[PDB]
Amino acid sequence: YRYDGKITNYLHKTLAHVPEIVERDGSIGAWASEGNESGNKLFRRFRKMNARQSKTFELEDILKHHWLYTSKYLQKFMEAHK
DNA sequence: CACAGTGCTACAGACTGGAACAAAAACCCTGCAG
């Protein structure tokens, strides 16, 4: 009664092409939007605490500081070999 | 005349060196004193 002439784009996509995708790639959730999307959170705390802050400069500094946050070289120091 | 900042800038402040001055510290000394 609810699916006669209408289906959500996703119920279709997830009931149809997934086997083909994971045959093609072998992974989906690894390619998920999360890495981008989640990241937005950081952007917000970078537009507040580490911003310049005036319209001209601040994008530069959010960007720079973001790049530093996400570098490996820094993160290696976290465990500090345990 | 809200206030803790907001990073990167600005160049203010922190440094040497010999050449020599001066003052002061705390000894030794000699001076003039009972």
Swiss-Prot record:
The RING-type zinc finger mediates the E3 ubiquitin-protein ligase activity. The NBD (nonamer binding) DNA-binding domain mediates the specific binding to the nonamer RSS motif by forming a tightly interwoven homodimer that binds and synapses 2 nonamer elements, with each NBD making contact with both DNA molecules. Each RSS is composed of well-conserved heptamer (consensus 5'-CACAGTG-3') and nonamer (consensus 5'-ACAAAAACC-3') sequences separated by a spacer of either 12 bp or 23 bp. A divalent metal cation binds at residue 37. In the adult, predominantly expressed in the thymus with lower levels in the pronephros, mesonephros and ovary. It is found in: Nucleus. It comes from Danio rerio. Coiled coil: none annotated. The lineage of its organism: Eukaryota, Metazoa, Chordata, Craniata, Vertebrata. Catalytic component of the RAG complex, a multiprotein complex that mediates the DNA cleavage phase during V(D)J recombination. V(D)J recombination assembles a diverse repertoire of immunoglobulin and T-cell receptor genes in developing B and T lymphocytes through rearrangement of different V (variable), in some cases D (diversity), and J (joining) gene segments. In the RAG complex, RAG1 mediates the DNA-binding to the conserved recombination signal sequences (RSS) and catalyzes the DNA cleavage activities by introducing a double-strand break between the RSS and the adjacent coding segment. Belongs to the RAG1 family. It comes from the Eukaryota. The chain holds residues 948 to 1029 of 1057 of the full protein. Homodimer. Component of the RAG complex composed of core components rag1 and rag2. This is V(D)J recombination-activating protein 1.
